[PDB]
Design a protein around this nucleic acid. Structure first.
Ligand code: ATP
Ligand code: ATP
Ligand code: ATP
Ligand code: CA
Ligand code: CA
Ligand code: CA
Ligand code: CA
Ligand code: CA
Ligand code: CA
Lengths: 319, 319, 311
DNA sequence: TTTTTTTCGTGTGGTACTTTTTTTTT
DNA sequence: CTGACGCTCAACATAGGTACCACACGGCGAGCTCGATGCAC
DNA sequence: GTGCATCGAGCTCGCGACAAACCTTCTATGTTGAGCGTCAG
């Protein structure tokens, strides 16, 4: 795991300065090393002279230079992929949800965005040989649609004890975009103490659709949303967790899409399209089945797979 | 219940600022705690320095951090589900209408959207052991179709006093979309003084269909509708009432039958589909019987049940 | 009845502002209070500052807050139900046509939609003890099928004076959908000066069926029809008149359903389905209602208007 | 006393119509 | 050593049929309309 | 005292793109062509 920020006192950093950093949301050496000099300057009691010393010492403990692609290829052979509960999705994702990267699932209502998040909150606790991340799950909810009954249904499927599954899911409810971002600061502190394997934000952009309304507030909305996605990327790099965010859709009311029966695109604009490394486009299928399409990915070919929402969470289409 | 906003002044907030907050529609500590910093700044005489202090004190009285899913599972085991008067619907909903969430019922004319709302306006006054919410009902009407004679019919079925039932229903008629939203501010003030168990908006989207006409006003329509649904969600979280809204349908005039799509869909677009946690799709049966289908839900399997609109409200089909 | 809009300027509104409202179709305080802020802003010369003040002043004169269902139940015990001239129809409607709501009658040709509208245009002038609304009737005709000779036949049945009955019916003929909506603005002005108990639009959707032809004009048709039904609803709330509209039918080729789509089905609080029976008898069926069970009654079109079947 | 610098950000679904065609003696 | 014939899959195309629809910021300044104040017999 | 004239106040409507960029083909049933196994000689 990441090195706790207490290691800086061994490099001559004053314990008072270390405590100032923790109040600023830095709990690991990696978090300090990745932070720009501007962020440390903004912290009261951290002058520019102190900031240079802190960054220099942190860079000693964290490798931040060039390296061969051969070494990097070796590490990526060891990153954990979390099973989605469906063989077809795992074939589509070539293993499952990938840790250390931001994955976005979007689609219209009832398409299963919350159902997949509930499945992942349990499958991430399985041992690695069974397709899990072997760690606790963190669930940040913005819609109020977190249902522990669904988690117990999934835990029944894999033979896990439901009581222990619930204890390993940290749940927080976000009521506004400011609270949604503030929860991440507590998330970083929690992830230092115990090993978390998955972070779920559902829905990531639900609150931005109403806190910032109108074209007048669009620039402030995207700027605030972009800062939120940077913190998610920081947590993914710092702790190696898998970040799964859920997105909504907006209809295109132009006549350009004649060949599409109901054209719609995810909200968030270009800020969230670039930030997400993997985007899954869920849509309604026949009955209880749904279709997942690789909308964006650095390494996955654009393809479709069909899954179903069963009583015991997300699974393959039985019929 | 929620803590009154007067608790803030015990933490050092000026009583004049509290009065300014109440004039802006915040009547409980939860309403202030859930408010983003933007909303408090908009209120005249609330500086940013005041806004930060007000939010800081509110967060001390309201838990807004992470918690175990075990504790959240414990809390949800105590929420109230209000019976719909029909055995089949209660089985379909696994108990009845759930408090603390937005439930949307839609369907074409005559399908029984208003009849269910009339039954719920009475059943919610039953004691909890009989399937009620043991609270008063609030009925916001946007069509003029509120008939107290129907309430008296349902009250006779359950043996309740007709005069007592009518006194425990608060009725307001909304004449436009602006008035419909403004009634929610009065709703929060009323819900602080007396225990309300159910809030009915019927119909939630009837007035939006004509106040904003054409694609030119579509964006302003959905933005206004989205703000209305946020206030409904805020009331559900703040007071724990069940919010039941009613929606209309619009025909699909493309090759929906060619692609096997349904010929009619609810209005409101993606703004109302995402916001509603549970959506019920009522359709006409034979005679007085109707069919209710779970259109969207976080925990309910997509199924159907048959109910009837009897002389004494919504009930089970007698044939 | 409704308070004249001239009461606003006694509350601090400039006289010129009230003039602009009247030219925009607002003639009572209720009409202004019920209007959204958008409608007032669209009036040239009225800014968002004026609109906020006007709406604030109107809300003082018009109650628009929450109230007990007991109080509302008390008011609905005093609404007037206009007799349809038929014992069976009145039993089916539990009193007759209800004021303050939009009632829609549809059916194929010859079913008696216009005959009922002719009977209602007379019975609405009866004293309340005899089942009337004790007010004048307004008849907006879009088909050209208004026949004053039918009114005289109905008036003779109840003993009313034939000349007096015809003087209490305001008749207008609509030649297109734009004109049909525009007549409602003139209707609001007339209803302030005199007590009307019934407004009839026959037929409401007849002109929409041809002014907007094809799927290419369907959205424009339904948007225009929706605004027409909102204006009718505004009149029903503002003046407490019974609004009776008449609708046509279309065959389902997937056996006949009313035209207008979902816009008119949701808007209409009560819908009556009329169909042909033996001889001159007809059958009326409650197709939609918030409080009336779906039942059927049989009436007849006699020489003296709609009445009970003689079978 | 001198001396300007710098773009950012997408959102929003609506809306039903139209009937047609007779056949076969014991 | 081989060909005629039926089964199933893999790929492919059309289905009662029909089609249109627009706005929305951040803001200063002409502009020009009328009330409130001042002026000519 | 009557008719006339002016300034403050109000509310209304512009102002700008470089004239392309868009790529989406749907669900579901039955059809069309081909790959393949059977059986007899
Ligand atoms: N126990 C269950 N068994 C089967 N299906 C279920 C069960 N619980 C929920 N579902 C289905 O899950 C579907 C998707 O619900 P979900 O909460 O995942 O939607 P969503 O994509 O988050 O939508 P929204 O935008 O409204 O939040 C629903 O249509 C419902 O039918
Ligand atoms: N007392 C009663 N007994 C039996 N059926 C009744 C009774 N009152 C009303 N109904 C029936 O209830 C049905 C549904 O009416 P309701 O007001 O619920 O419609 P709705 O879904 O709100 O429609 P709309 O879209 O017009 O608002 C009507 O068709 C009517 O036949
Ligand atoms: N004086 C009368 N005595 C008896 N029956 C009459 C009399 N006048 C008209 N009728 C009957 O009224 C019936 C229905 O006419 P009405 O004008 O009500 O039709 P409608 O429903 O408006 O039809 P449409 O769709 O053509 O407008 C006719 O079939 C006619 O026989
Ligand atoms: Ca969800
Ligand atoms: Ca991307
Ligand atoms: Ca209704
Ligand atoms: Ca939803
Ligand atoms: Ca007629
Ligand atoms: Ca209706």
């Amino acid at each position: 795991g990441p090195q706790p920020i207490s290691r800086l006192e061994q490099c001559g950093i004053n314990a008072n300065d270390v405590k100032k950093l923790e109040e600023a949301g830095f709990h690991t050496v990696e978090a300090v090393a990745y932070a720009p000099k501007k962020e440390l300057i903004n912290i009261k009691g951290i002058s520019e002279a102190k900031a240079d010393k802190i960054l220099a010492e942190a860079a000693k403990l964290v490798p931040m230079g060039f390296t061969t692609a051969t070494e990097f290829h070796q590490r990526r052979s060891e990153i954990i992929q979390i099973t989605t509960g469906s063989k077809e999705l795992d074939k589509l994702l070539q293993g499952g949800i990938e840790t250390g990267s931001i994955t976005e699932m979007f689609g219209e209502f009832r398409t299963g965005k919350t159902q997949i998040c509930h499945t992942l909150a349990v499958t991430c606790q399985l041992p690695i040989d069974r397709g899990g991340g072997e760690g606790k799950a963190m669930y940040i909810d913005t819609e109020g649609t977190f249902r522990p009954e669904r988690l117990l249904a999934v835990a029944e499927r894999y033979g896990l004890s439901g009581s222990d599954v619930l204890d390993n899911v940290a749940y927080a409810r976000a009521f506004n975009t400011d609270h949604q971002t503030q929860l991440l600061y507590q998330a970083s502190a929690m992830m230092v103490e115990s090993r978390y394997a998955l972070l779920i934000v559902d829905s990531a952009t639900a609150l931005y659709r109403t806190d910032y309304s109108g074209r007048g507030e669009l620039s402030a909305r995207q700027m605030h949303l972009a800062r939120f996605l940077r913190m998610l990327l920081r947590l993914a790099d710092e702790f190696g967790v898998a970040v799964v965010i859920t997105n909504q859709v907006v209809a295109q009311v132009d006549g350009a899409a004649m060949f599409a029966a109901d054209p719609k695109k995810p909200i968030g604009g270009n800020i969230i399209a670039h930030a997400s490394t993997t985007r899954l486009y869920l849509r309604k299928g026949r009955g209880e089945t749904r279709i997942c399409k690789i909308y964006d990915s650095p390494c996955l070919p654009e393809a479709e797979a069909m899954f179903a929402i069963n009583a015991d969470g997300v699974g393959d289409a039985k019929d």
